[PDB]
Amino acid sequence: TNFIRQIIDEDLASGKHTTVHTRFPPEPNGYLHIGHAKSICLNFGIAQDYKGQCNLRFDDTNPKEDIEYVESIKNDVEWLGFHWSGNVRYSSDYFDQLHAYAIELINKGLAYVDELTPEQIREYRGTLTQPGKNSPYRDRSVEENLALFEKMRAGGFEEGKACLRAKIDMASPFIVMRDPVLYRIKFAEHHQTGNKWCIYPMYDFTHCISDALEGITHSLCTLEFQDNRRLYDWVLDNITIPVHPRQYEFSRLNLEYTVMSKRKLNLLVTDKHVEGWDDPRMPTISGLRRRGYTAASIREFCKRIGVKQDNTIEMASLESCIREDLNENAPRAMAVIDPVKLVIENYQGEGEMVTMPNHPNPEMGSRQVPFSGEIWIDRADFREEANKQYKRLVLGKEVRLRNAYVIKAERVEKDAEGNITTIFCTYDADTLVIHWVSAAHALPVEIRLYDRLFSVPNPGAADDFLSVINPESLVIKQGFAEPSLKDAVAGKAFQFEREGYFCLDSRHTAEKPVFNRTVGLRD
Last residue of a domain, one of 295, 329, 363: 329
Question: Does residue 233 sit within a domain?
Answer: yes
Q: How many domains does the chain have?
A: 5
Annotated binding residue at 261?
yes
Residue (of 104, 120, 518, 11) closest to 290 by Cα position = 518
Q: Are residues 432 and 457 in the same domain?
A: no
Annotated binding residue at 471?
no
Which of helix, strand or coil describes residue 414? coil
Q: How far apart (Å, rounded) are the C-alpha atoms in residues 283 and 93? A: 32
Annotated binding residue at 35?
yes
Query: What are φ and ψ of residue 398, in 5° steps?
Result: -165, -175
Question: Does residue 491 sit within a domain?
Answer: yes
Task: Report the side by side order of strands in the sheet with 422-425.
Answer: 409-413, 422-425, 339-344, 374-378, 437-438
Annotated binding residue at 29?
yes
Residue (of 68, 50, 48, 49) closest to 58 by Cα position = 68
Task: Name the catalytic one among 5, 138, 230, 252.
Answer: 252
Task: Count Cβ atoms below 10 Å from residue 369 Cβ, excluding itself.
Answer: 22
Q: Are residues 224 and 318 in the same domain?
A: no
Q: Are residues 77 and 142 in the same domain?
A: no
Task: Name the catalytic one among 10, 16, 27, 68.
Answer: 27
Q: How far apart (Å, rounded) are the C-alpha atoms in residues 471 and 463? A: 17
Annotated binding residue at 86?
no
Annotated binding residue at 260?
yes
Q: Are residues 81 and 217 in the same domain?
A: yes
Q: How far apart (Å, rounded) are the C-alpha atoms in residues 220 and 245? A: 10
- How crowded is the C-beta side of 467, counted as CA atoms within 13 Å? 3
Burial grade of 392 (CB within 10 A; 0-12, 13-18, 19 or more): middle
Q: How far apart (Å, rounded) are the C-alpha atoms in residues 134 and 121? A: 9
User: Residue 190's domain is classified under what CATH number?
Assistant: 3.90.800.10
Q: How far apart (Å, rounded) are the C-alpha atoms in residues 286 and 280? A: 8
Question: Does residue 272 sit within a domain?
Answer: yes
- One-letter-per-residue 3-state SS of 35-96: HHHHHHHHHHHHHHHCCCEEEEEECCCCCCCCCCHHHHHHHHHHHHCCCCCCCCEEHHHHHH
Q: How far apart (Å, rounded) are the C-alpha atoms in residues 517 and 309? A: 32
Q: How far apart (Å, rounded) are the C-alpha atoms in residues 468 and 455? A: 6
Q: Are residues 208 and 237 in the same domain?
A: yes
Cβ-contact 308, 510 below 8 angstroms: no
Q: Are residues 216 and 299 in the same domain?
A: no
Q: How far apart (Å, rounded) are the C-alpha atoms in residues 58 and 65? A: 10
Last residue of a domain, one of 168, 200, 232: 200
Domain range holding 342? 338-442
Q: Are residues 85 and 209 in the same domain?
A: yes
Q: Are residues 79 and 216 in the same domain?
A: yes
- How crowded is the C-beta side of 371, counted as CA atoms within 13 Å? 23
Question: Does residue 6 sit within a domain?
Answer: no
Q: How far apart (Å, rounded) are the C-alpha atoms in residues 108 and 23? A: 30
The number of helices, as runs of H, and strands, as runs of E, in the chain is 12, 23
Per the document, the length of the chain is 523
| Cβ within 8 Å of residue 48, ≥6 positions away | 54, 82, 83
Q: Are residues 360 and 421 in the same domain?
A: yes
Which of helix, strand or coil describes residue 9? helix
Q: How far apart (Å, rounded) are the C-alpha atoms in residues 283 and 292? A: 13
Query: Is 486 a known active-site residue?
Result: no
Q: Are residues 149 and 100 in the same domain?
A: yes
First to last CA, the chain: 32
DSSP E strands, 311-430: 332-333, 335-336, 339-344, 351-357, 366-372, 374-378, 409-413, 422-425
Which of helix, strand or coil describes residue 504? strand
User: Residue 502's domain is classified under what CATH number?
Assistant: 2.40.240.10
Annotated binding residue at 33?
yes
Task: Count Cβ atoms below 10 Å from residue 193 Cβ, excluding itself.
Answer: 11
For residue 232, give the H/E element and its range: helix 228-238
Annotated binding residue at 372?
no
Question: Does residue 9 sit within a domain?
Answer: no
Task: Name the catalytic one among 196, 262, 414, 507.
Answer: 262
Cβ-contact 351, 372 below 8 angstroms: yes
Q: Are residues 261 and 184 in the same domain?
A: no
Annotated binding residue at 39?
yes
DSSP string, 165-227: EE---TT-SSGGGS--EEEEE--S--SSSTTS-SEEE-HHHHHHHHHHHHT-SEEEEEGGGTT
Which of helix, strand or coil describes residue 28? coil
Query: Is 262 a known active-site residue?
Result: yes
Provide the phi-psi class of 230: left if phi over 0, else alpha when psi is between -120 and 50, else beta: alpha
DSSP symbol at 444: E
- How crowded is the C-beta side of 206, counted as CA atoms within 13 Å? 22
User: Residue 297's domain is classified under what CATH number?
Assistant: 1.10.1160.10
Please say whether the dihedral angle defined by the alpha carbons of residues 377, 378, 379 and 381, taken in this order, is positive or negative. Answer: negative
Annotated binding residue at 117?
no
For 227-244, b/e burial (b = at least 16 CB within 10 A) is ebbbbbebbbebbebeee
Q: Are residues 428 and 351 in the same domain?
A: yes
Last residue of a domain, one of 291, 307, 329: 329
Annotated binding residue at 38?
yes
Q: How far apart (Å, rounded) are the C-alpha atoms in residues 191 and 189? A: 6
Question: Does residue 487 sit within a domain?
Answer: yes
**Helix, strand, coil percentages in the chain from 3-state DSSP, rounded to 5:** 30, 25, 50
Which of helix, strand or coil describes residue 476? strand
Which of helix, strand or coil describes residue 114? strand
For residue 160, what are the CA distances in angstroms to 163, 181, 195?
7, 12, 18
DSSP string, 297-343: HHHHHHTTTT---S--B-HHHHHHHHHHHHHHHS-EE-EESSEEEEE
Question: Does residue 78 sit within a domain?
Answer: yes
Cβ-contact 84, 110 below 8 angstroms: no
Residue (of 222, 255, 252) closest to 460 by Cα position = 255
Task: Count Cβ atoms below 10 Å from residue 22 Cβ, excluding itself.
Answer: 27
Question: Does residue 523 sit within a domain?
Answer: no
Residue (of 258, 204, 260) closest to 232 by Cα position = 204
Q: How far apart (Å, rounded) are the C-alpha atoms in residues 332 and 366? A: 10
Q: What is the resolution of this structure in A?
A: 2.6
Q: How far apart (Å, rounded) are the C-alpha atoms in residues 39 and 4? A: 13
Annotated binding residue at 308?
no
